[PDB]
Design a binder for this molecule. Structure first.
Ligand SMILES: *C/C=C(C)/C=C/C=C(C)/C=C/C1=C(C)CCCC1(C)C
Ligand SMILES: CCCCCCCCCCCCCCCCCCCC
Ligand SMILES: CCCCCCCCCCCCCCCCCCCC
Ligand SMILES: CCCCCCCCCCCCCCCCCCCC
Ligand SMILES: CCCCCCCCCCCCCCCCCCCC
Ligand SMILES: CCCCCCCCCCCCCCCCCCCC
Ligand SMILES: CCCCCC
Ligand SMILES: CCCCCC
Ligand SMILES: CCCCCC
Ligand SMILES: CCCCCC
Ligand SMILES: CCCCCC
Ligand SMILES: [Kr]
Ligand SMILES: [Kr]
Ligand SMILES: [Kr]
Ligand SMILES: [Kr]
Ligand SMILES: [Kr]
Ligand SMILES: [Kr]
Ligand SMILES: [Kr]
Ligand SMILES: [Kr]
Ligand SMILES: [Kr]
Ligand SMILES: [Kr]
Ligand SMILES: [Kr]
Ligand SMILES: [Kr]
Ligand SMILES: [Kr]
Ligand SMILES: [Kr]
Ligand SMILES: [Kr]
Ligand SMILES: [Kr]
Ligand SMILES: [Kr]
Ligand SMILES: [Kr]
Ligand SMILES: [Kr]
Length: 217
């Protein structure tokens, strides 16, 4: 389980670099005016690459620091919302959502950190879980209500972004509780790494598909 967890960090390290550079090279496939989302997805993949390098070395040391994962999440999740909100919003409406979602994300991730760095099953562990789950549900319900005014191909492209988030982000709370269901500490790390690859690489690809639709492809 330990050696599988290590190999998955290394697979995910190269996966995030490939995400980064695949998206940068793919930016020539779309009109300059729809490229900003692709550049941000590459920056999200790039921050993750940098932290996955650290997390792999941290795991291989025998003294894993979950701080490296949670710092990755506090930076990348708000960048991922900057992308999604830009499909449907501009001016004050964009700035207010980015502010409000950004606060919610930071509280979600901070609470998770507080609980994860407590003993599994302790009142601290559950307090963290419940406060993060509530915030998570607030974000997902906000996300579900975005894009009522989109038409045709742009509407379907955005629905694919939303469904990837609505389904892919469920893996994080499953990872968080893995260590109470069994003697499976390393399975938390496995589930988080798979989620990060699906969610960062998957979102990169769907943001690219959106940039192609908006370019009239
Ligand atoms: C690129 C990284 C992403 C999208 C990471 C997302 C992380 C979460 C959505 C975490 C959510 C959590 C809960 C809802 C409950 C337990 C605590 C967390 C932080 C694992
Ligand atoms: C035609 C598309 C141009 C791609 C620009 C990508 C910029 C690469 C810079 C490296 C990352 C820093
Ligand atoms: C044309 C614009 C392209 C932007 C994306 C380029 C890809 C990013 C390169 C890697 C980023 C790594 C950043 C390292 C610092 C992470 C934070 C450190 C604090 C723990
Ligand atoms: C402790 C918070 C738990 C429930 C989520 C409430 C979200 C409020 C968002 C703040 C921005 C206004
Ligand atoms: C443990 C693995 C869990 C797998 C969940 C994968 C998430 C599925 C994403 C659903 C929506 C994707 C949008 C389709 C795009 C087609 C073009
Ligand atoms: C782990 C198995 C991978 C299955 C989930 C793939 C979902 C990717 C979504 C982006 C669509 C392109
Ligand atoms: C390297 C951190 C960048 C966040 C914007
Ligand atoms: C419209 C911006 C809100 C400012 C917060 C008091
Ligand atoms: C927190 C930042 C809002 C102005
Ligand atoms: C309705 C979402 C809450 C689920 C708690 C495990
Ligand atoms: C019930 C959880 C699906 C992923
Ligand atoms: Kr692996
Ligand atoms: Kr992976
Ligand atoms: Kr990968
Ligand atoms: Kr990607
Ligand atoms: Kr490409
Ligand atoms: Kr964007
Ligand atoms: Kr991304
Ligand atoms: Kr987007
Ligand atoms: Kr945000
Ligand atoms: Kr809950
Ligand atoms: Kr609970
Ligand atoms: Kr969320
Ligand atoms: Kr969200
Ligand atoms: Kr899932
Ligand atoms: Kr799963
Ligand atoms: Kr498990
Ligand atoms: Kr992993
Ligand atoms: Kr994966
Ligand atoms: Kr998977």
């Amino acid at each position: 389980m330990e050696e599988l967890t290590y190999r998955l960090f290394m697979v995910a390290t190269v996966g995030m670099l490939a995400g980064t550079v695949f998206l940068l090279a793919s930016s020539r496939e779309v009109k300059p005016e729809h490229r900003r989302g692709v550049y941000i997805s590459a920056l999200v993949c790039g921050i993750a690459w940098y932290h996955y390098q650290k997390m792999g070395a941290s795991w291989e040391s025998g003294s894993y620091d979950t701080g490296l994962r949670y710092v990755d999440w506090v930076l990348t999740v708000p960048l991922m919302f900057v992308e999604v909100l830009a499909v449907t919003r501009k001016g004050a409406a964009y700035n207010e959502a980015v502010r409000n979602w950004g606060i919610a994300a930071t509280v979600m991730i901070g609470a998770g950190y507080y609980g994860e760095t407590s003993a599994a099953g302790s009142n601290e562990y559950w307090t963290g879980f419940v406060i993060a789950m509530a915030t998570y549900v607030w974000l997902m319900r906000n996300l579900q209500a975005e894009g009522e005014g989109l038409k045709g191909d742009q509407a379907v492209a955005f629905e694919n972004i939303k469904n990837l988030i609505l389904v892919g982000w469920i893996i994080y709370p499953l990872g968080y509780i893995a260590p109470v269901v069994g003697d499976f500490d390393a399975i938390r790390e496995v589930l988080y790494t798979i989620a990060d690859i699906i969610n960062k690489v998957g979102l990169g690809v769907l943001v690219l598909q959106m940039a192609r639709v908006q370019s009239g492809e």
